Design a protein around this motif. Structure first.
Motif, short mmCIF file in Angstrom:
data_model
loop_
_atom_site.label_atom_id
_atom_site.label_comp_id
_atom_site.label_asym_id
_atom_site.label_seq_id
_atom_site.Cartn_x
_atom_site.Cartn_y
_atom_site.Cartn_z
N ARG A 77 13.89 2.03 1.90
CA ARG A 77 15.31 2.06 2.23
C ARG A 77 15.99 0.72 2.33
O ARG A 77 17.18 0.57 2.04
CB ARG A 77 15.51 2.86 3.54
CG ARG A 77 15.30 2.01 4.78
CD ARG A 77 15.81 2.46 6.07
NE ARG A 77 15.31 1.66 7.14
CZ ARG A 77 15.65 0.46 7.51
NH1 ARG A 77 16.79 -0.08 7.10
NH2 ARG A 77 14.86 -0.24 8.31
N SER A 78 15.26 -0.30 2.72
CA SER A 78 15.69 -1.68 2.93
C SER A 78 14.54 -2.63 2.55
O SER A 78 13.42 -2.43 2.99
CB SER A 78 15.97 -1.77 4.41
OG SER A 78 16.46 -2.99 4.77
N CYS A 79 14.81 -3.64 1.76
CA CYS A 79 13.86 -4.57 1.27
C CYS A 79 14.23 -6.03 1.27
O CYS A 79 15.11 -6.35 0.52
CB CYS A 79 13.63 -4.20 -0.22
SG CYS A 79 12.41 -5.22 -1.03
N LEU A 111 10.24 -12.16 1.61
CA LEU A 111 9.19 -12.00 2.55
C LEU A 111 8.45 -10.67 2.56
O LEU A 111 7.21 -10.64 2.63
CB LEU A 111 9.62 -12.24 4.01
CG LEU A 111 9.92 -13.64 4.48
CD1 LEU A 111 10.30 -13.57 5.97
CD2 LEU A 111 8.62 -14.44 4.43
N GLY A 112 9.21 -9.62 2.59
CA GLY A 112 8.83 -8.26 2.70
C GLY A 112 8.24 -7.67 1.47
O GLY A 112 7.10 -7.21 1.59
N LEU A 113 8.85 -7.65 0.33
CA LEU A 113 8.37 -7.07 -0.89
C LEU A 113 6.96 -7.39 -1.31
O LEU A 113 6.22 -6.42 -1.60
CB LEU A 113 9.47 -6.98 -1.94
CG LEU A 113 9.16 -6.19 -3.19
CD1 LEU A 113 9.00 -4.72 -2.82
CD2 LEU A 113 10.33 -6.37 -4.15
N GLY A 168 2.05 -21.57 -1.39
CA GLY A 168 2.84 -20.82 -0.43
C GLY A 168 4.20 -21.45 -0.20
O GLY A 168 4.26 -22.68 -0.34
N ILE A 169 5.19 -20.64 0.15
CA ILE A 169 6.55 -21.16 0.40
C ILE A 169 6.94 -20.65 1.77
O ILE A 169 6.84 -19.43 1.78
CB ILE A 169 7.48 -20.64 -0.72
CG1 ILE A 169 6.92 -21.12 -2.06
CG2 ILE A 169 8.86 -21.30 -0.51
CD1 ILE A 169 7.65 -20.48 -3.27
N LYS A 170 7.23 -21.48 2.72
CA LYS A 170 7.58 -20.97 4.04
C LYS A 170 9.06 -20.53 4.01
O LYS A 170 9.79 -21.23 3.33
CB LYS A 170 7.62 -22.05 5.13
CG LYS A 170 6.34 -22.87 5.18
CD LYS A 170 5.19 -21.95 5.63
CE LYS A 170 4.06 -22.73 6.27
NZ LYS A 170 3.51 -22.20 7.58
N1 LIG Z 1 13.83 -9.86 8.12
C1 LIG Z 1 12.69 -9.08 8.13
N2 LIG Z 1 12.31 -8.36 9.25
C2 LIG Z 1 11.15 -7.58 9.24
C3 LIG Z 1 10.35 -7.53 8.10
C4 LIG Z 1 10.73 -8.31 6.86
O1 LIG Z 1 10.01 -8.25 5.86
N3 LIG Z 1 11.95 -9.08 6.95
N4 LIG Z 1 9.17 -6.70 8.15
C5 LIG Z 1 8.98 -5.59 7.20
F1 LIG Z 1 8.99 -3.46 8.05
C6 LIG Z 1 9.46 -4.20 7.06
C7 LIG Z 1 11.06 -4.34 6.97
N5 LIG Z 1 11.57 -5.03 5.71
C8 LIG Z 1 12.80 -5.79 5.88
C9 LIG Z 1 13.97 -5.06 5.29
C10 LIG Z 1 15.08 -5.68 6.15
O2 LIG Z 1 15.44 -6.94 5.60
C11 LIG Z 1 14.48 -5.80 7.54
C12 LIG Z 1 14.70 -4.58 8.48
O3 LIG Z 1 16.13 -4.56 8.82
P1 LIG Z 1 16.92 -3.18 8.74
O4 LIG Z 1 18.27 -3.78 9.28
O5 LIG Z 1 17.10 -2.73 7.36
O6 LIG Z 1 16.27 -2.18 9.59
O7 LIG Z 1 13.03 -5.92 7.34
C13 LIG Z 1 10.88 -4.95 4.53
O8 LIG Z 1 11.28 -5.40 3.46
N6 LIG Z 1 9.65 -4.31 4.47
C14 LIG Z 1 8.98 -3.76 5.55
O9 LIG Z 1 7.93 -3.10 5.43
C15 LIG Z 1 8.54 -6.50 9.36
C16 LIG Z 1 7.64 -7.69 9.81
N7 LIG Z 1 6.74 -7.92 8.62
C17 LIG Z 1 6.50 -9.28 8.15
C18 LIG Z 1 7.22 -10.36 8.72
C19 LIG Z 1 6.96 -11.65 8.31
C20 LIG Z 1 6.00 -11.95 7.34
C21 LIG Z 1 5.70 -13.38 6.89
O10 LIG Z 1 6.37 -14.30 7.43
N8 LIG Z 1 4.72 -13.56 5.91
C22 LIG Z 1 4.54 -14.98 5.61
C23 LIG Z 1 3.21 -15.40 6.28
C24 LIG Z 1 1.99 -14.58 6.76
C25 LIG Z 1 1.51 -15.16 8.14
O11 LIG Z 1 1.31 -14.35 9.06
O12 LIG Z 1 1.47 -16.43 8.19
C26 LIG Z 1 4.55 -15.10 4.10
O13 LIG Z 1 4.41 -13.99 3.53
O14 LIG Z 1 4.67 -16.24 3.62
C27 LIG Z 1 5.27 -10.85 6.78
C28 LIG Z 1 5.49 -9.57 7.19
C29 LIG Z 1 9.52 -6.12 10.43
N9 LIG Z 1 10.77 -6.88 10.38
#
Ligand SMILES: [N]C1=NC2=C(C(=O)[N]1)N([C]1F[C@@]13=[C]N([C]1[C][C]([O])[C]([C]OP([O])([O])=O)O1)C(=O)[N]C3=O)[C]([C][N]C1=[C][C]=C(C(=O)[N][C]([C][C]C([O])=O)C([O])=O)[C]=[C]1)[C][N]2
Ligand SMILES: [N]C1=NC2=C(C(=O)[N]1)N([C]1F[C@@]13=[C]N([C]1[C][C]([O])[C]([C]OP([O])([O])=O)O1)C(=O)[N]C3=O)[C]([C][N]C1=[C][C]=C(C(=O)[N][C]([C][C]C([O])=O)C([O])=O)[C]=[C]1)[C][N]2
Lengths: 264, 264
Positions: free
Chosen positions: A166-168, A172-174, A257-259
């Protein structure tokens, strides 16, 4: 990965600026679908190094029906920290709906075990679904389920799965969601004696946080390396008996890695 | 419509033969996504005449929270007949989940009213969802929800919606689902003062029944005519006050209807 960098670009080229819950601001598109044939490789992003330890343990945590971040901590996984209560509780998020959806009539449904039963007895069923969107409990969850409903499908002796996310958070998440689900497909298929088919990802609000733009340009300039190979070393007695040490990701050689900061 | 005939063809060219619940046999594909910009026209199939009276009343029926086919009958709509019990009951299908999802704690949630509240107070929310997949009540429904979860999205003052349809009878079912949802988007948008955006349809097991092959070749040989225009004549006080007579479909000129048997 090709499909993932193509999603990133499309968000860049077509997203409209949107305000968000977190107060961060995003570039957003609505409705996207990508497909991963699992026989080609384990779809783990190569243009940035992904933390496998975190991905694996979050999955194992979901499968135990746990919603307390303790097991995570025990394992040096800290990705759910910002949302947990004083006691390390998240409320009835993922694990609880998957393993014990509470019924009006006071019962608990284990959707995971139901799924196993359907895959073993009625593979052509168009109803093999797991849902974490329990309307009667959203008010108790720390965060509403992001990956909220998935469906399994069997054809030609191969297992496929479709996730509705539903939300991406694309950055970071995908990368985590994709690998995680690819992992579950591999586990279910081993337990059911099937080969893996496709992982179909479908997204609702798919976005790039505004403070991930530099990180995006950076990644977009790297060339994808070859997908690794997932090896599952043993066949546990059940879907509930896998251990971290049972998995092996062969030939993962990512760019660095990419912070990026997480939006809370 | 272009997208719909393209789906039909793809099922023909890529579907694998699958056994099914009904014992009929299908050609099936897993995972498909199509998009309809609602500003281009009302997405009502033109390559076959669609029964609007049935589409409209099924929708109005869902919105009242009704699960008894009586209101349908009163209106000469007989599409739900094969599944109703002795009393004309279907169990807690669509209408009941939409208007009164029963909670563990003995409460009833009206997801439709919740949605209205979110669209009016928090349009950027990534959580505007209606789900008919209530795991704790599937055993009581005559048929599991085919169209099972949809999400609304607002950007640029336009309302979009995405439907996850777990199972789709491309020939009989789809034309109805599409129009139905397009209709709801138009209604919600009028109630919220938004313009319509896109209707995104996502499918799980999308198939053609084996005894609809002639019907398919037939339709595939017709050229799509121009999309009609939906006119909503009045603005009811609520989403619950529309009447059949409030809608007008302008310039619908379809090729003739194609009969096909429904698989039970
Ligand atoms: N901003 C945010 N928050 C959160 C998350 C993310 O990714 N981002 N997670 C994830 F259950 C979940 C969700 N998602 C997102 C979509 C949106 O943007 C949010 C929610 O809001 P609403 O308003 O729509 O309700 O979120 C997605 O995409 N997916 C999913 O499954 C959680 C926690 N987990 C995590 C965090 C962080 C991380 C990192 O940072 N990683 C890093 C490292 C590793 C160590 O530990 O060091 C890289 O990768 O680089 C991971 C995971 C919850 N919240
Ligand atoms: N086979 C069938 N059945 C049914 C249906 C259909 O469509 N088909 N429907 C529909 F809820 C729903 C579902 N779906 C489908 C999918 C599948 O295939 C099935 C189920 O199974 P499972 O196993 O998966 O569970 O189903 C879909 O797609 N969708 C949806 O939503 C219902 C009923 N409805 C109807 C019927 C019929 C009709 C017709 O016939 N129409 C015609 C006419 C009109 C008058 O009335 O005349 C035309 O169109 O031509 C419609 C509708 C339930 N079941």
């Amino acid at each position: 990965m090709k499909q993932y960098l193509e999603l990133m670009q499309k968000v860049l080229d077509e997203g409209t600026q949107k305000n968000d819950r977190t107060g961060t601001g995003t570039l957003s598109i609505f409705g996207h679908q990508m497909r991963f044939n699992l026989q080609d490789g384990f779809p783990l992003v190569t243009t940035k190094r992904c933390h496998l330890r975190s991905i694996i343990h979050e999955l194992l945590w979901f499968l135990q029906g746990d919603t307390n971040i303790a097991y995570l901590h025990e394992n040096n996984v800290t990705i759910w920290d910002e949302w947990a209560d004083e006691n390390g509780d998240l409320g009835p998020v993922y694990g609880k709906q998957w393993r014990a959806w509470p019924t009006p009539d006071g019962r608990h449904i284990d959707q995971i075990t139901t799924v196993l039963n359907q895959l073993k007895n009625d593979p052509d069923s168009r109803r093999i679904i797991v849902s974490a969107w329990n309307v009667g409990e959203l008010d108790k969850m720390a965060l509403a389920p992001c990956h909220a409903f998935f469906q399994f499908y069997v054809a030609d002796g191969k297992l496929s799965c479709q996730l509705y996310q539903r939300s991406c958070d694309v950055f970071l998440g995908l990368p985590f969601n994709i690998a995680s689900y690819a992992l579950l497909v591999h586990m279910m298929a081993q337990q059911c004696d099937l080969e893996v088919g496709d992982f179909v990802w479908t997204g609702g609000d798919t976005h790039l946080y505004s403070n991930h733009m530099d990180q995006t340009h950076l990644q977009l300039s790297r060339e994808p390396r070859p997908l690794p190979k997932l090896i599952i070393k043993r066949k546990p007695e059940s879907i509930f008996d896998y251990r971290f040490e049972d998995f092996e990701i062969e030939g993962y050689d990512p760019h660095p890695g990419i912070k990026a900061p997480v939006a809370i």
